[PDB]
């Protein structure tokens, strides 16, 4: 063009063609280079203090179900369950023991809880409930059972002794009624200190665990899967000033920095989509004052620079990670796992910042940008491989999950399938199927049918295609 | 051509372009797109009824293990044997100890049977019957034991008390005679009410199950592998009407419209199938009227499109499946399998039906229509592979067969084969050699030269042609 | 050429084409069909026997594991050891009490036997024999303990009493001196009669196992590994005519047919290398009588046709195969092992001998023939693949071996090396490096940079040539 | 060229013909082949005394395990802890019960230690060590608790009877204070003599392990993992002259051999060096004194042959390691670790030293230097790759490692993100997810997005521009 192609040029060209000739010193490439190392020290200062969270919960779990669950070693936390009356009762019993035989036994320090929720009332801190049916009357032979799905809640409140009592048992009555049953749901929360939390140096993460423990019998199997589930609750309570000094000042002036190199950033982004506007005011000097070409103004769309889009996008987690750490860190938040994939997501962006970066002599964007061209292809293919894809996932799910271990819901069927298309645990699944050779022996037989034809699809007929769109993309850039 | 040139191109044509030009509009196309979001949806709310089956079959199976089997635990069903003689009489006894104080001990609730079958005299429930031989004296030492294979089947029957006893043992007194026993064969039969189904509230699931608790001493090594079998038996058992309005018409109203949408399709397949007989009627236009060319009609019987005939099996088994599901839920069938096989390969074969409706821009049909370019010469590749497979297959299953977990029938050989040449429990086949290393060293030095042969030959030698196919037909598809 | 090239062209067509020309019918082609069937149910009929002998042998080495190991389960073969004096003494006295009350408290049948060998007196049935130190003081505190490696054998010899005693103890003695103890062996053999030989009627296989439970202390590290190995030892004990009139004839008019369908290919094979003869003895026809070309006289040894030395090769395994057979089963002899690679080799071979009748429309030879165009680069190529490929065997056989489970020896180091370059078990050989994280770190960090290296050098670098070559020549090949 | 172009072309041509033409009989050839068998067989017999002493070590460990832990068996190195106050009274009082009745109960022999280190007292061998904080007074409901990190360590001395009590407790009046309570640490030291080491017949290894056995309470999470870690440290104890007169010759007879070998090698490695120096002497000729091409002498660099610089480079390894050997087998050196990395890695980088050899028919070189042309392109690919690597990497570690078990560090991580691009462990990654659906389903749902888009992107998007890359040098090379 004639008066803007300079400006045009210009744009486009790399970072030290472009400094050569004109403008100011790369301040913006430094910043993303720091920012590279500077969110991921972030990143993994905050995952000390992440793992030292869930750690402390897990375990506590862990060490729930030791005390809590009579007979469970660390396996088999599915294929636990009753089998026997007594036992079972044995099992219901043996929690409420261990509960209320509790700072006497155990290793930790786990505080209780007077009743102000639901399941419990005011004073009550142990809550076995009953779920059982309100009708029932089963006998298989006989006739008349006359039963409806209204699930009566026989409650059966207790806490425990304090180590002074004083001076100014239900639960040993009672009984289950094992034909209406339903489940049995023992209900209680520990309060704990976190004293893992000395390594970072903030004493102050007093938790509250809520233990429900479960004999599920929802399949009337005379099989009730016993399990112990736990949810954590977070607050401080009531120690300042110890040995907390440089670290509360080290961490707040470490986030603020990621904050600044993060926004600074994104200044001199919005700076370059700010020249991004103008360009389109152009309009392509309006067809050079000449009408050549007849341009059709959606190339104009994919015009813009992606790279800034993702930038930005990696800094909005960024920044909105920091203010999630400093507010979960040194404030009333509780929510390590939304911060974890945001930092993480926002790591996971910005390390691939490095490839724009990276189009030095001209041969790292060949390899880069095969993507770019074989991506239409790629989309076009992925189409009628996902649509066989779902077919077999849809088909696996209700046909084979009844009767095995990997296909027992839709993500699991596409972990499975998608792990069997690279070839992982592709002998398991036909192993899965030996169980079933002596009995629904027509589920076995299509589950061949279904699983050679399935990989042997996909990793000889489809993958192939694939590798070759890649492998032809390829082809092309090079050219 | 002259006259039926416009008919002969017109219905080729892609659906945009030919309802562009004539005919009707697309009804055919939309009720396609229906039909695959219909039979998935009637695929799942089969398979929630479909797994509870599976769930509870299994689940008192489990329970089974764990009431009528003397220290069986969740884990090893194979390597659960007897070893010592009073060891199985206490297996023996704790079988028919729990069969006697089964409503006492159970969870669930099982109801007896009175002996209808020939197992069982006119009165008995639990029947444990020696298989042991009619003629026999094995002494290693001695001369003469004189052995045939009569298998004298001494059944000892017992059935149990109920609640109330009234005022108008036996098999404590069992003696085995080991050195002649086959096996003992415990079968007792338990009915039960399924009350797993009352989420979609079909409370009708009375069960019969068919325990054969076996210790099997086929192989008279000391070792008498005891095992438990159930068979499942359903029907219903009187209660019509208690909170089951709603879901009786839904479900019913439900597969009737896939029903109409499978027949609505059906009819509309075969009209473009009775289009198909018309132009065969026109024989090539006769050769153009000038007997030109010298056709061999050969390329006549692959004229017509086979996406249609596909349609058409697909819907058959979805039609089949609805009836089966409609009869199986509302009025005494019961067979799952069957129906969850038919119902899911219909939803596998209907869900690939989306690949007949991508055709747009004229470049997903490049991708997929390589496998028809390739099909002729991957067809006379395999055979030669598959040739070579039976080889190490039959092979295998002789040879390795005995001496390892992996090849003990064909099934598992062309599962364990098929997964070598992908690459997954590669070095676990190896593993069970290890053993073999000190025993055998023939067998473990003839499976090193098996194995490396059989993997390195198809990873490497033969895999690569089956890629450079399908490559290959996507080198001359592209063009 | 002038006379002989009729008889020159007419060897080298295919069947089809020969048949038509001249000649007599294709009587070798049905024979090489049949041969296929016949070796192949030759094969499965063995293999029915086959482990029947190896199940027998093995599920008795399982039975004696539950009787004279005191608390071994199935499960930890390896890893079941004595690590206290009273617990290795009562493992002792276990295998004698049990071998003692053998036909008390087992559930098979096994005869004891006098002693005939060198472990034995002449009288003597069980013999635990003291493998120690002659001379030995150690002391590791204070000076001088004298040791030389000469191994006293104090065997403490005792038969056990039959149901009749005869109206005309020592081990209870028993002190091992267990700082110089090199091991403790029990030996002692059980006479069995296999029962489990009544599927194909062949009641006489009268067994005598070897067991030798072995106290291993080669060590010296506190944990004296226990184990039980068993060697078989097989023939008749007199009983002929029960029910053995048809199995007898069958099975040797069955093994005689594949003598005979054998022996017929392998004549009419015979006469094929007799034509091949005659060519070398033409000498291409003396030049043609013209002295061209300049024929250099080694094309001539690639000149005769290979399939059908193969196909003799496979013969001799059969008929090799069949007269072990017919010893094995209707003879003295005993050694499974040999005759099923034998006739697994044969069918094997004689499986892959249909290619050889795949050479139809001239396309089957084009995807089979590429190996024969590739070998010559693949040979090359592999040397120096295998060169490398030892560098890391030997490296991580002696390094890794030590400290992890997968390079125990060079045979499970080349197992795990070949599933690592297509990828199995490659994430647990970098799992067993987690325990050496904090031990021998130096060898944790090699372990990464060793196994790195070694799979992305060969899955990647290495193999992409291997897949190169092979593609490369079905790249020339179909021009 | 003029003058020097006979030596020029001289220096680069084969073996075969610079014998052919000039100088010396090939020496250089033979001492390579012979360097490859003596130093394997060097590296072998290293091996045998080299895993002698990791078995030894580590069963020992094993041993101390079965002793000083109560209720460990072999599995759950971790998964073993204690839950309950008691329990863990007992795991320690079973520790210190053991170790004062070790010689009576232990099957090898442990001499003890009298306190010369800092744990320990003068006159003490076992010291169990509370680790427990200084302030404290934690109460999950009221108010102040006042904590500071400051570990006072209440060591508790005692040390053993020996066999003559001398004519002229404590422990168990052990209290921990659980809620203070950091760890406590069980440290006692075990002299051996390792009678193993006699198959190469050096008797003198007395070697001293170090027990560490940790209840690790750093968590406070009412479970405390038991942990037994050993160090050990061996020298001689006086025992010259038994049957070792033969081995200490050949073994020191064999290593000078090697180092000969090396060294002979290494002199013909520096006589190769000579000759290059004297090239860069020429300055190409001064540009064939023509002053023509004008050359950058970047170039002159690369002449050098590398294999030569990769033979002294193994070489040196090999000599250090002989040295090594010869002090740690003969003399008072102890690190096989180092050794066998260094005599390892020689053999590694010797083995390949036969590529070298191969350079016969022009054909070898075509295959081999592929990889020469391509790694200019794989090193630019590699960083990009790596990249995208890292962000999964120091994503998924943070984010997964604390939910899961494959991503615990970014070795780990590392490791997992290896073998998926490969496929191995790919859906037991998705498997631990399953956990997770019901805690933290966003960590779930991102775990599902991390592994799909990490394996989806390198197992197809990114491995086929590399295997491109390898083929594509290919394609070149053979032009
Ligand atoms: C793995 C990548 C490449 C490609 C085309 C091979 N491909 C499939 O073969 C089928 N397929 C799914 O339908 C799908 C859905 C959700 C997770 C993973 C997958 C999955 O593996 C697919 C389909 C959809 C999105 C991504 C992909
Ligand atoms: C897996 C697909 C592709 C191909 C050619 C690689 N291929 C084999 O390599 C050998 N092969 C069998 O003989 C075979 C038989 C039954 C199930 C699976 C297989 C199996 O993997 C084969 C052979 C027959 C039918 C399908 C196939
Ligand atoms: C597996 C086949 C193909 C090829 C070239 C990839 N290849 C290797 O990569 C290295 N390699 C051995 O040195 C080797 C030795 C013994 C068993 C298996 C192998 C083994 O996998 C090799 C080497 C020798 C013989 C066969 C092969
Ligand atoms: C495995 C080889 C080939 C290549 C390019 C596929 N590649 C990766 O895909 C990513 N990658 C790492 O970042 C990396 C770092 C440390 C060990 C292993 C790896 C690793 O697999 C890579 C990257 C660095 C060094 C070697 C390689």
């Given at each position: 063009?004639?008066?803007?192609?300079?400006?045009?040029?210009?744009?486009?060209?790399?970072?030290?063609?472009?400094?050569?000739?004109?403008?100011?010193?790369?301040?913006?490439?430094?910043?993303?280079?720091?920012?590279?190392?500077?969110?991921?020290?972030?990143?993994?200062?905050?995952?000390?203090?992440?793992?030292?969270?869930?750690?402390?919960?897990?375990?506590?779990?862990?060490?729930?179900?030791?005390?809590?669950?009579?007979?469970?070693?660390?396996?088999?936390?599915?294929?636990?369950?009753?089998?026997?009356?007594?036992?079972?009762?044995?099992?219901?019993?043996?929690?409420?023991?261990?509960?209320?035989?509790?700072?006497?036994?155990?290793?930790?320090?786990?505080?209780?809880?007077?009743?102000?929720?639901?399941?419990?009332?005011?004073?009550?801190?142990?809550?076995?409930?009953?779920?059982?049916?309100?009708?029932?009357?089963?006998?298989?032979?006989?006739?008349?059972?006359?039963?409806?799905?209204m699930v009566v809640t026989d409650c059966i409140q207790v806490d425990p002794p304090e180590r002074p009592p004083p001076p100014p048992s239900?639960?040993?009555?009672?009984?289950?009624?094992?034909?209406?049953?339903?489940?049995?749901?023992?209900?209680?929360?520990?309060?704990?200190?976190?004293?893992?939390?000395?390594?970072?140096?903030?004493?102050?993460?007093?938790?509250?665990?809520?233990?429900?423990?479960?004999?599920?019998?929802?399949?009337?199997?005379?099989?009730?899967?016993?399990?112990?589930?736990?949810?954590?609750?977070?607050?401080?309570?009531?120690?300042?000033?110890?040995?907390?000094?440089?670290?509360?000042?080290?961490?707040?002036?470490?986030?603020?920095?990621?904050?600044?190199?993060?926004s600074l950033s994104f200044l001199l982004c919005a700076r370059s989509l700010l020249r991004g506007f103008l360009l389109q005011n152009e309009?392509?000097?309006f067809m050079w004052r000449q009408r050549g070409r007849v341009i059709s103004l959606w190339e104009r769309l994919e015009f813009v620079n992606?790279?800034?889009?993702?930038?930005?996008?990696?800094?909005?987690?960024?920044?909105?990670?920091?203010?999630?750490?400093?507010?979960?860190?040194?404030?009333?938040?509780?929510?390590?796992?939304?911060?974890?994939?945001?930092?993480?997501?926002?790591?996971?962006?910005?390390?691939?910042?490095?490839?724009?970066?990276?189009?030095?002599?001209?041969?790292?964007?060949?390899?880069?940008?095969?993507?770019?061209?074989?991506?239409?292809?790629?989309?076009?293919?992925?189409?009628?491989?996902?649509?066989?894809?779902?077919?077999?996932?849809?088909?696996?799910?209700?046909?084979?999950?009844?009767?095995?271990?990997?296909?027992?819901?839709?993500?699991?069927?596409?972990?499975?399938?998608?792990?069997?298309?690279?070839?992982?645990?592709?002998?398991?699944?036909?192993?899965?199927?030996?169980?079933?050779?002596?009995?629904?022996?027509?589920?076995?037989?299509?589950?061949?049918?279904?699983?050679?034809?399935?990989?042997?699809?996909?990793?000889?007929?489809?993958?192939?295609?694939?590798?070759?769109?890649?492998?032809?993309?390829?082809?092309?850039?090079?050219?």
């Open positions: 063009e004639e008066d803007l192609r300079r400006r045009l040029k210009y744009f486009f060209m790399s970072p030290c063609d472009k400094f050569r000739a004109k403008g100011r010193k790369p301040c913006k490439l430094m910043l993303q280079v720091v920012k590279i190392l500077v969110v991921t020290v972030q990143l993994i200062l905050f995952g000390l203090s992440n793992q030292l969270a869930v750690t402390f919960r897990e375990e506590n779990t862990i060490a729930f179900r030791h005390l809590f669950l009579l007979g469970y070693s660390d396996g088999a936390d599915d294929t636990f369950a009753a089998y026997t009356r007594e036992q079972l009762y044995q099992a219901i019993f043996h929690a409420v023991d261990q509960y209320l035989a509790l700072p006497d036994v155990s290793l930790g320090r786990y505080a209780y809880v007077r009743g102000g929720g639901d399941p419990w009332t005011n004073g009550s801190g142990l809550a076995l409930c009953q779920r059982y049916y309100h009708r029932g009357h089963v006998d298989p032979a006989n006739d008349t059972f006359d039963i409806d799905p239900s639960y040993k009555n009672l009984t289950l009624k094992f034909h209406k049953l339903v489940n049995v749901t023992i209900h209680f929360r520990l309060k704990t200190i976190n004293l893992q939390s000395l390594i970072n140096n903030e004493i102050p993460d007093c938790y509250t665990f809520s233990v429900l423990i479960t004999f599920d019998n929802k399949a009337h199997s005379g099989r009730i899967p016993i399990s112990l589930e736990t949810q954590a609750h977070i607050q401080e309570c009531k120690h300042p000033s110890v040995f907390q000094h440089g670290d509360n000042s080290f961490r707040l002036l470490f986030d603020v920095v990621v904050i600044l190199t993060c309009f392509v000097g992606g790279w800034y889009i993702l930038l930005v996008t990696s800094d909005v987690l960024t920044i909105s990670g920091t203010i999630m750490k400093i507010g979960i860190e040194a404030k009333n938040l509780a929510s390590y796992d939304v911060c974890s994939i945001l930092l993480g997501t926002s790591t996971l962006l910005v390390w691939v910042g490095v490839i724009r970066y990276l189009t030095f002599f001209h041969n790292y964007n060949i390899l880069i940008a095969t993507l770019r061209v074989a991506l239409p292809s790629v989309m076009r293919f992925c189409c009628c491989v996902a649509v066989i894809y779902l077919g077999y996932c849809f088909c696996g799910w209700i046909v084979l999950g009844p009767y095995h271990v990997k296909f027992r819901s839709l993500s699991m069927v596409s972990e499975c399938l998608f792990s069997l298309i690279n070839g992982d645990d592709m002998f398991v699944t036909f192993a899965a199927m030996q169980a079933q050779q002596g009995r629904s022996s027509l589920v076995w037989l299509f589950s061949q049918l279904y699983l050679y034809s399935f990989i042997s699809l996909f990793i000889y007929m489809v993958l192939s295609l694939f590798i070759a769109l890649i492998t032809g993309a390829y082809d092309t850039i090079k050219h």
